[PDB]
DNA sequence: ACCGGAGGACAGTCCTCCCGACTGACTGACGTCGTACG
DNA sequence: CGTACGACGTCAGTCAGTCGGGAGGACTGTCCTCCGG
């Protein structure tokens, strides 16, 4: 049922046999069944919890930045830089 | 499929006919079919838009103020409280 | 080879709506008091 | 004066109705695998 890391990336049918499978035995390959990777729950209640948090921060930032491209700031990645910027408060 | 407003509110089978229906007609009430309520899409792309912007507003918030404040805002429902928070600077 | 997307089992929504519990109201029964008669 | 009967009032029990938890289930959209171009 779970396919192997590689068959997964290569997208071919997996034989699925453990410990090494079809191809991964053949091409003498590093065959892993990596564990099931978590996501946050897609439920309505959780969408809504997260939308309520986002609204409140969104509101708090309308007052910090009444003037624009908050989105400019939101895209930056550098900490010094962002902080150099803000010290134009 | 859609039940009338009153049957919905009361949770009894609706006849659903046109215009009115059995119990609004009988019981003497103004039977309505309200529009479905617009909600946000519960897709994964959309939960991720929203979790990942909330995260980045949290990251920026923390260059400006202490983490203990993050936690307060993330819970406030009152617009005076979100603003006062900011006023104690 | 490689990878866009078809295919499909599955996760979880989001409707209408049946069913059970709880509360209120109404009716009946009993008890107590008051009046009348011996 | 004392006893008995009737009437009224109060309490309990039963039934009905209504808010509610939530079952049922069609459906929306996920999130895998792996086809075939
Ligand atoms: Zn494999
Ligand atoms: Zn393998
Ligand atoms: Zn109806
Ligand atoms: Zn109706």
Swiss-Prot record, chains A, B:
Association between GAL11 and GAL4 may serve to expedite phosphorylation of GAL4. Zn(2+) 2 binds at residues 4, 21, 24, 31. Signal peptide: none annotated. Zn(2+) 1 binds at residues 4, 7, 14, 21. It is found in: Nucleus. Residues 4-31 bind DNA. Binds DNA as a homodimer. Interacts directly with the mediator subunits GAL11/MED15 and SRB4/MED17. This protein is a positive regulator for the gene expression of the galactose-induced genes such as GAL1, GAL2, GAL7, GAL10, and MEL1 which code for the enzymes used to convert galactose to glucose. It recognizes a 17 base pair sequence in (5'-CGGRNNRCYNYNCNCCG-3') the upstream activating sequence (UAS-G) of these genes. Present with 166 molecules/cell in log phase SD medium. The 9aaTAD motif (residues 862 to 870) is a transactivation domain present in a large number of yeast and animal transcription factors. This is Regulatory protein GAL4.
């Amino acid at each position: 049922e779970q396919a192997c890391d590689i068959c997964r990336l290569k997208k071919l049918k997996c034989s699925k046999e453990k410990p090494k499978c079809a191809k991964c035995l053949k091409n003498n390959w590093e065959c892993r069944y990596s564990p099931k990777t978590k996501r946050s729950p897609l439920t309505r209640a959780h969408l809504t919890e997260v939308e309520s948090r986002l609204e409140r921060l969104e509101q708090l930032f309308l007052l910090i930045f009444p003037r624009e491209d908050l989105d400019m700031i939101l895209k930056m990645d550098s900490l010094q830089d962002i902080k150099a910027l803000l010290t134009g408060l």
